Amino acid sequence: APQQINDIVHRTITPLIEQQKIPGMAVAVIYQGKPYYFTWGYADIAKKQPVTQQTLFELGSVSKTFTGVLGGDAIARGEIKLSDPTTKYWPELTAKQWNGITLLHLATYTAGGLPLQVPDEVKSSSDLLRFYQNWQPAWAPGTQRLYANSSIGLFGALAVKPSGLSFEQAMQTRVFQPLKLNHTWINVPPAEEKNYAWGYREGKAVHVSPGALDAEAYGVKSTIEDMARWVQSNLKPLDINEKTLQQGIQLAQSRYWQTGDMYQGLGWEMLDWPVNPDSIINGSDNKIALAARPVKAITPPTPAVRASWVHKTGATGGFGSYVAFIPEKELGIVMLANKNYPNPARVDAAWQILNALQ
């Protein structure tokens, strides 16, 4: 790799790992469309297993970008419309507050205050129905963005209903496989378990627990190589042969809502490039990222803007991940770690690295 890339990455990531006490980390830098890989530390401390390019990390919320793209693919297939009412795909949802709440609203956290987490008490499908039936919005639909697994999670579930496929099957066959993401999983098969890093929370080794709509909201695990390929795909959607997937990716980066200087896509979030680093750094802090904020409707949505900082932070109990890229520049980065460390530290490192290379 170019010594510039090596120095920039190492000078940035080494202190980050030290300061944040990150056990293991993998980084991919996409420079002029080509990936460059870097690994540090341990995937499994007790077994002294190092991080490698084949190490599986929990993506957490970065999963929502796959979910967004899968939804976009379903739109392109004509199987769903984002303008349709939610009740069209879930007739049992008869409570009156669901009037006027569309798939768009679910996909973009603008339904009116759906909670961050689906309650752990929800186990069966009937529990799930009861939950959404009894949910009372704090706001009118399409007025406030509140980041929520219960929102985009339900979107994912409904988006694949007409296809007849389970969410996992739709994702595998319509997204993972055509993009040759051969080491990306919703459920890690035993054959791949040896590469599945442990997460670390408070010194304890942890993996993500099963939960309602987990697959749809935070259930993807991937390697640094597949995630680099994921970024390449989202950098250059036109190079992709499957028409609907190609279109789906474009739709996922459309700008549907604005709050502050940020735009909400399907899973992906975007800002105009060049960005104010303080804005994306401070904005990633949960006190802002998880806050209720008013939205300006983008009518109609702006098609994917090449001059954008496109990104997503992700977390599970034991993992912290970040993906960012700039389509106009053929420039991107993936940061995968088996510790959930503060978002602003992730974004700061990413902007430091990409800015030096642009």
Ligand SMILES: CCN1C(=O)CC(=O)N(CC)C1=S
């Ligand atoms: C649905 C119309 N539309 C958009 O709003 C944005 C976009 O990028 N594209 C192209 C795939 C379309 S068709």
Ligand SMILES: CCN1C(=O)CC(=O)N(CC)C1=S
């Ligand atoms: C349910 C997954 N998960 C976590 O475990 C921890 C966390 O901070 N976040 C982000 C809100 C998520 S989605």
